[PDB]
């Protein structure tokens, strides 16, 4: 398997929407690689449209927990939680290819039923938007007010724009 | 496996519509082959109707990143992003068979919802059309205005016509 080969060289591929399955796999791989060598950095290649918030945070929390520094490479598209994960890479080691696309926005969800239940859902997602925005602000250097504004609607960015924003540190060329 | 055999001889087959899965596989193979020998050229055989723009660019960006020169062969049909990839082959090493067909056109997409959201989508796809057209222009030699005009609608070309246009460099015969 081509991916299993990449894993042998400490490279994890997040190239599908993020769901609990994908998340559990990535998490396991991260813990595994960290177990084999807590020194050698790990590379997380990203080409994902995003997905579940709790799934992404599972990956994020693991990236932070392990000792090895996790570098992120955006290949293709890094949208929503995928962009969040890209920004979560080890400061100084967050890359993107020349024509990569990075999109940041606010959480998506739904609420059905009684006013009380809708309120429960509303408070949860609004809380999640804040938690995420705060981390983005820390990771980018942008003030929270700026992140809140810029993520109000789908915000597509080129690799050059992602770099200027502080989402990545370097664009891979040749 | 017949394809795995081709990979052993540095030949990657892009013979299906281009989606994130296909894209990630091609990218991995490209990085793999470049790792084994950054000198020996790689051959990308193309027979695809096209697909995702971000998926194609993932492939494109990788073709550019690696040291090995990537030659492209259009077998059957090379449409949309597949045609783009064909044109992206190493200058001088872009081939097509006698009865191959190459079709270039503008990006396809959709927008639903509020005017503001439709506008977000509009700007994105219009920006992508430009980014692609510019590369096509560089790769073919055709001025941008010409690429913009000729891709306004599905533009089917014979191998002879693809050669005259600058999409390929040579037609394989015998």
């Amino acid at each position: 398997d081509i991916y299993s080969r990449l894993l042998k060289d400490r490279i994890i591929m997040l190239g599908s929407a993020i769901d609990d399955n994908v998340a559990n796999s990535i998490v396991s791989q991260l813990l595994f690689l960290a177990a084999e060598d807590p020194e050698k950095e790990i590379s997380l290649y990203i080409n994902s449209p995003g997905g579940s918030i709790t799934a992404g945070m599972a990956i994020y929390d693991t990236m932070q927990f392990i000792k090895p520094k996790v570098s992120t490479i955006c290949i293709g598209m890094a949208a929503s939680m995928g962009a969040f994960l890209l920004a979560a890479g080890e400061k100084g080691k967050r890359y993107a290819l020349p024509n990569s696309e990075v999109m940041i926005h606010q959480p998506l969800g739904g609420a059905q039923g009684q006013a009380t239940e809708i309120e429960i859902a509303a408070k949860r997602i609004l809380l999640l938007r804040d938690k995420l925005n705060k981390v983005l602000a820390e990771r980018t250097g942008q003030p929270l007010e700026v992140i809140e504004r810029d993520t109000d609607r789908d915000n597509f960015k080129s690799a050059e724009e992602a770099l200027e924003y502080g989402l990545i540190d370097k664009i891979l060329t040749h | 496996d017949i394809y795995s055999r081709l990979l052993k001889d540095r030949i990657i087959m892009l013979g299906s519509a281009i989606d994130d899965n296909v894209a990630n596989s091609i990218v991995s193979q490209l990085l793999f082959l470049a790792a084994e020998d950054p000198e020996k050229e790689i051959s990308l055989y193309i027979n695809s109707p096209g697909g995702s723009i971000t998926a194609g660019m993932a492939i494109y960006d990788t073709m550019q990143f690696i040291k090995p020169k990537v030659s492209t062969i259009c077998i059957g049909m090379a449409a949309s992003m597949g045609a783009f990839l064909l044109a992206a082959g190493e200058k001088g090493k872009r081939y097509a068979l006698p009865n191959s067909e190459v079709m270039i056109h503008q990006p396809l997409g959709g927008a639903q919802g509020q005017a503001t959201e439709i506008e977000i989508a509009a700007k994105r796809i219009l920006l992508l059309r430009d980014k692609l057209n510019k590369v096509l222009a560089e790769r073919t030699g055709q001025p941008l205005e010409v690429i913009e005009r000729d891709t306004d609608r599905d533009n089917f070309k014979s191998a002879e016509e693809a050669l005259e246009y600058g999409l390929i460099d040579k037609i394989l015969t015998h």
């Binding site: 060289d9 950095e41 590379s43 290649y45 490479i73 290949i75 290819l97 891979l172 | 990085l31 790792a35």
Partner: peptide, 6 residues
């Protein structure tokens, strides 16, 4: 994706 990731 090396030089330098790995």
């Amino acid at each position: 994706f090396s030089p330098x990731a790995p």
